[PDB]
């Protein structure tokens, strides 16, 4: 019944700012402190402060002194966490986290239920979109029980783009390569491996999705 | 501020062994701590809180333990999907700091990688580009090196790999390679080649296609 909903992906420009929000229900939002925890990419988890639901008032880690600042809106039971003059150093993704019970101040508590976090992506890089290439297999290859396929995701900026297959309705035997960036563009991958018996004649599409861009392709694998 | 001290960085283990991963406040910190899960790209999930309190619908096989400064975190008898990274966090007084956060895998046995290569497709050449791709899938451990062929002679520029994280039902990892030239260069050259040396094999389990794009 609690849960906490955190808004969408962020993309903004060094010296720009960001607002996150994150949406409570559940419970007596007034009752539990509400922690905004950080992490940058492949690094760990950094706790950045907590804002006290009932008085308003925020306590900030030294670490993020000055440039972050935790506001409510109790009226819709949310908490929001603004940074200004976004640096580099402050890609990374922000977590909302209720503290799991309540009664003192000058102790904390361990932190429950937590948002889905957020993406803020700091750079001067240009929303540009996908490009979506079948991965068909070659020519003079076959042979075999199981034949993999898959769909090249070039040229995209920001993250993220969402790969399905067959609407979702294939799951098992798919790989989706983490997003690499080369030159401000990003590139990924996935594959998919089904019966040699089932493809080229059942259909076989990779769903691609690039948010950003209002990107959407389905493109159907195709044999060569 | 009391800051938490976490060990190991990273654990590789098997299914049904144990695991112990310590966490030391550089302060008192009466037992205000707690352990957390996190997955890849997931919100971290708590395990245990109050040092050693089991959080609602966690399994048993966890269980956390320690007093004053020291503190572990107990996994007893690995299942496949207990791979992840896992964080400890003090709350005596703020700041409420985590530990630097320890890396388990799941050991399981040394598999090689089952190799696909991928000539670039009809559209992306109209538009100038040619990419070649390789899948290098399901194998263990993650350790593994890739390296492309035109004609024979090795290329080592415009190459971009990316890596799985562990497979939750089997434990292998896998991995892309895109080799990544013009539409030109592509076309003025024939064979192409995607060349995987990993611990399983003591020659390059190989892949190629010629520019019939076979």
């Known amino acids: 019944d609690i849960k906490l909903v955190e808004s969408g992906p962020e993309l903004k420009k060094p010296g720009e700012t960001v607002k996150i929000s994150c949406k409570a229900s559940?419970?007596?939002?007034?009752?539990?402190?509400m922690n905004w925890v950080k992490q940058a990419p492949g690094k760990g988890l950094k706790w950045m402060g907590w804002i006290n639901t009932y008085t308003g008032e925020p306590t900030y880690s030294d670490d993020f002194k000055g440039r972050f600042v935790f506001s409510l809106e109790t009226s819709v039971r949310t908490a929001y966490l603004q940074i200004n003059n976004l640096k580099n150093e402050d890609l990374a993704t922000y977590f909302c986290?209720?503290?799991?019970?309540?009664?003192?101040?000058?102790?904390?508590?361990?932190?429950?239920?937590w948002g889905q976090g957020t993406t803020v992506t700091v750079s001067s890089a240009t929303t540009t979109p996908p490009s979506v290439y079948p991965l068909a297999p070659g020519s003079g290859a076959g042979t075999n029980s199981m034949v993999t396929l898959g769909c090249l995701v070039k040229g995209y900026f920001p993250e993220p783009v969402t790969v399905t297959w067959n609407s979702g309705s294939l799951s098992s035997g798919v790989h989706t390569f983490p997003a690499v960036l080369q030159s401000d563009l990003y590139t990924l991958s996935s594959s998919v491996t089904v019966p040699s018996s089932t493809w080229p004649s059942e259909t076989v599409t990779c769903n691609v999705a690039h948010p950003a861009s209002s990107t959407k392709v389905d493109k159907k694998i195709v044999p060569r | 501020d009391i800051v938490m001290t976490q060990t190991p960085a990273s654990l590789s283990a098997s299914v049904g062994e144990s695991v112990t991963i310590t966490c030391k406040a550089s302060?008192?910190?009466?037992?205000?701590l707690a352990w957390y899960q996190q997955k890849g790209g997931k919100s971290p999930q708590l395990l245990v809180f109050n040092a050693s309190t089991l959080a609602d619908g966690v399994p048993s096989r966890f269980s956390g333990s320690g007093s004053g400064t020291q503190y572990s975190l107990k996994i007893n008898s690995l299942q496949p999907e207990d791979f992840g990274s896992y964080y400890c966090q003090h709350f005596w007084s703020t700041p409420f700091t985590f530990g630097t956060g320890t890396n388990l895998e799941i050991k399981r046995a040394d598999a090689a990688p089952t190799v696909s290569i991928f000539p670039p497709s009809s559209e992306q050449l109209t538009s100038g580009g040619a990419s070649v791709v390789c899948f290098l899938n399901n194998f263990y451990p993650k350790d593994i090196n890739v390296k492309w062929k035109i004609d024979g002679s090795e290329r080592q520029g415009g190459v971009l790999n990316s890596w799985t994280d562990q497979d939750s039902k089997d434990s292998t990892y896998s991995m892309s390679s895109t080799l990544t030239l013009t539409k030109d260069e592509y076309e003025r050259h024939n064979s192409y080649t995607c060349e995987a040396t990993h611990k399983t094999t003591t020659s390059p389990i190989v892949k190629s296609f010629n520019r019939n794009e076979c």
């Open positions: 302060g008192n910190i009466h037992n205000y």
């Open positions: 986290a209720r503290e799991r019970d309540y009664g003192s101040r000058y102790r904390g508590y361990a932190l429950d239920f």
């Open positions: 559940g419970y007596i939002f007034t009752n539990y402190g």
